[PDB]
Amino acid sequence: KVFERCELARTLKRLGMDGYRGISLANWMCLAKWESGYNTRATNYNAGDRSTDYGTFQINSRYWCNDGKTPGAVNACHLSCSALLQDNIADAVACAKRVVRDPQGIRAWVAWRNRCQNRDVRQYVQGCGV
């Protein structure tokens, strides 16, 4: 599923993301835009290290979810990677909450650092009634 911006914004808000661990909803929206373009089916295999990023938030198979083919996988979210490719983003959201509970927080995502951090991200939530 490819979400429309405001549709995703209200969905995240209902899932308790606004201000989660100090992260504003606009930041979460900036991250999903750059990571997947709001597409829940998004997958990116990293040939250099044998891991794959899954879904909307492009969560990694080395530490967060299990796909059975990544060396040293940890499965911290205790989820099959398949769960992060569904139209229902409830699992991806619970897992993304778990990732940010680590020391680095939202900075765990380099893309956040490159395209969101210290930027005017108001536009991601503008007009969504959120």
Swiss-Prot record:
It holds the Pfam family Lys. Residues 1-130 form the C-type lysozyme domain. Gene3D superfamilies: 1.10.530.10. It comes from the Eukaryota. Its EC number is 3.2.1.17. GO terms for biological process: antimicrobial humoral response; defense response to bacterium; defense response to Gram-negative bacterium; defense response to Gram-positive bacterium; inflammatory response; killing of cells of another organism. One of its GO terms (molecular function) is identical protein binding. It is found in: Secreted. The active site is at E35, D53. It is an enzyme of class 3 (hydrolase). Disulfide bonds join C6-C128, C30-C116, C65-C81, C77-C95. It catalyses: Hydrolysis of (1->4)-beta-linkages between N-acetylmuramic acid and N-acetyl-D-glucosamine residues in a peptidoglycan and between N-acetyl-D-glucosamine residues in chitodextrins. Keywords: Amyloid, Amyloidosis, Antimicrobial, Bacteriolytic enzyme, Disease variant, Disulfide bond, Glycosidase, Hydrolase, Secreted, Signal. CDD domains: LYZ_C (cd16897). One of its GO terms (cellular component) is extracellular region. It is linked to Amyloidosis, hereditary systemic 5: A form of hereditary systemic amyloidosis, a disorder characterized by amyloid deposition in multiple tissues resulting in a wide clinical spectrum. AMYLD5 primarily affects the viscera, and the predominant clinical features are renal dysfunction of varying severity, and intra-abdominal bleeding. Inheritance is autosomal dominant. Belongs to the glycosyl hydrolase 22 family. This is Lysozyme C.
